Amino acid sequence: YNPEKKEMIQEVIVEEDLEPFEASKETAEQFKHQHGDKVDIFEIPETGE
Amino acid sequence: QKYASIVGVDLLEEITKDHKVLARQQLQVLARYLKMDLDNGERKFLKEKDTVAELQAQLDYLNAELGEFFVN
Amino acid sequence: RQQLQVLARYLKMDLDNGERKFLKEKDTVAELQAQLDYLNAELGEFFVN
Amino acid sequence: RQQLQVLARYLKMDLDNGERKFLKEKDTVAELQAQLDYLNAELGEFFVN
Amino acid sequence: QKYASIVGVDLLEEITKDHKVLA
């Protein structure tokens, strides 16, 4: 804890689609459940990720 | 080298990649300009693959209950 | 549109692969829904429920 | 604009590097102008000229 | 090998191409 640098988080709306990242199956379904329409999740058929 | 200890085990074309990255990114922006959805296809597919599994479950159930002989 | 097509062709990328696989699954549904609608005809709603 | 950005990112090129270095020099000026405005306050115009 | 029988005769840069195709 450095009171000169007190960590908060601001909610922003993605004005334009993000660069994809890899998650586990479990963690991706967790993103899909939260975001609905506003996320796309696709199995990478080699890895399973 | 710590896996090695426990089990007992002892011991050019990244330029063609960096172009295809650029082409991939260039494609994405043209798509975004054309209001074009390069996943719409695969999305609708995954959603139909679910309705099949669902109907195949209903139909596999009735074979369990009545038997092959009666359904044929 | 034309510029997109040539980048796709360069990336060995198939912008229909999605819709093709879909149309081919929509057929296997119609087929299973026919088999299942048949058995409701034969046994009746009351017996299948 | 978007097409430009991706070519830049491909060229490991930094379209802000210029403006960043500038803002950081505009600060060292304000800082030296403060030191120099101070000494005019203390000694006076007449003595510094 | 059938020409060989009649006459009597016994026996990297395809990536720069694929770009120039695109251009």
PDB file of C-alpha atoms in Angstrom, chain C residues 19-42:
ATOM      1  CA  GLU C  19     -21.929 -20.804 -43.399  1.00  0.00           C
ATOM      2  CA  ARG C  20     -21.184 -24.133 -45.258  1.00  0.00           C
ATOM      3  CA  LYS C  21     -20.872 -26.213 -42.032  1.00  0.00           C
ATOM      4  CA  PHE C  22     -24.041 -24.416 -40.769  1.00  0.00           C
ATOM      5  CA  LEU C  23     -26.217 -25.300 -43.816  1.00  0.00           C
ATOM      6  CA  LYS C  24     -24.987 -28.940 -43.524  1.00  0.00           C
ATOM      7  CA  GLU C  25     -26.060 -29.015 -39.738  1.00  0.00           C
ATOM      8  CA  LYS C  26     -29.453 -27.333 -40.504  1.00  0.00           C
ATOM      9  CA  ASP C  27     -30.075 -30.445 -42.746  1.00  0.00           C
ATOM     10  CA  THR C  28     -29.188 -32.997 -39.959  1.00  0.00           C
ATOM     11  CA  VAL C  29     -31.697 -31.104 -37.679  1.00  0.00           C
ATOM     12  CA  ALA C  30     -34.565 -31.191 -40.234  1.00  0.00           C
ATOM     13  CA  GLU C  31     -33.699 -34.925 -40.645  1.00  0.00           C
ATOM     14  CA  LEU C  32     -33.825 -35.681 -36.833  1.00  0.00           C
ATOM     15  CA  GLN C  33     -36.919 -33.440 -36.398  1.00  0.00           C
ATOM     16  CA  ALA C  34     -38.601 -35.601 -39.135  1.00  0.00           C
ATOM     17  CA  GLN C  35     -37.714 -38.843 -37.253  1.00  0.00           C
ATOM     18  CA  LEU C  36     -39.036 -37.350 -33.971  1.00  0.00           C
ATOM     19  CA  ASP C  37     -42.208 -35.815 -35.483  1.00  0.00           C
ATOM     20  CA  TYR C  38     -42.858 -39.301 -36.999  1.00  0.00           C
ATOM     21  CA  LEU C  39     -42.757 -41.077 -33.585  1.00  0.00           C
ATOM     22  CA  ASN C  40     -45.154 -38.425 -32.110  1.00  0.00           C
ATOM     23  CA  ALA C  41     -47.524 -39.261 -35.056  1.00  0.00           C
ATOM     24  CA  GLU C  42     -47.298 -43.036 -34.291  1.00  0.00           C
TER      25      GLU C  42
END
